[PDB]
Amino acid sequence: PLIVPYNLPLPGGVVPRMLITILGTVKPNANRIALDFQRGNDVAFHFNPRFNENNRRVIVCNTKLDNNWGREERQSVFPFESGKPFKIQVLVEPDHFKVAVNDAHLLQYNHRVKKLNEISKLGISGDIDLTSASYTMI
Ligand SMILES: Cc1ccc(S[C@@H]2O[C@H](CO)[C@H](O)[C@H](n3cc(-c4ccc(F)c(F)c4)nn3)[C@H]2O)cc1
Ligand SMILES: [Cl-]
Known part of the structure; x- marks a missing residue:
């Protein structure tokens, strides 16, 4: 397995049609996972499954600018499960990051x-x- 936290360089940044694929297995009794697409110290896109926020599972997405978190975007569809293998695909589109887990948008x-x-x-x-982290153009 790859060492977590893991840094994947994205040479020359991201561009529409770039697909990032992350394969791994959630630990038993997991609490949290995070993906951080970073622009220097800023976090352009933080994708943060929380397995127990007040006894609810939720994905929190946000941006950090000059060390300040912005307005959270929340998704209660929660496709991760403790102990189980997953695939995250992040496709860069012109106006958004598009995320699918286990082949489902x-x-x-x-x-x-x-x-x-x-x-x-x-x-x-x-x-x-973490099993693998890579990118390709589609
Ligand atoms: C005013 C205020 C008060 C509280 C908060 S809470 C905050 O909320 C953010 C999204 O709005 C991020 O989720 C923050 N965060 C999570 C992790 C993180 C590190 C390692 C991991 F393995 C992981 F899974 C996650 N690092 N930073 C969290 O601290 C925010 C604003
Ligand atoms: Cl968290």
Whole structure:
């Protein structure tokens, strides 16, 4: 397995038609997972499954600018399960990141950070065994 937290460089940033695929297995009794598409110290797109926020499972998405988190976008569709293998696909589209889990569309996140070619790393963190993280053009 890859070491978590894992840094995946995205050379030259992201661009529409770039597909990022993350394969892993959620740990038993997981609490949290996070993907962080980063522009330097800013987080253009934070995708954060929370397994127990007040006894609810929720995905929280947000952007961090100058160390400040913005308005959260929340999704109660929660496709992850403790102990189980998953696939996350993040497709960069012109106006949003489009996320599918286990081949099922989950959510879109509109681009708040608009300099896509400066979003040049992806961090992967939290309660997973990480099998692979890669990108390709479709
Ligand atoms: C005013 C205020 C008060 C409280 C908050 S809470 C905050 O909410 C954010 C989204 O709005 C992020 O989720 C933040 N966060 C999570 C992780 C994180 C690290 C490692 C992992 F493995 C993981 F799974 C997640 N790092 N940073 C969280 O602290 C926010 C604003
Ligand atoms: Cl969290």
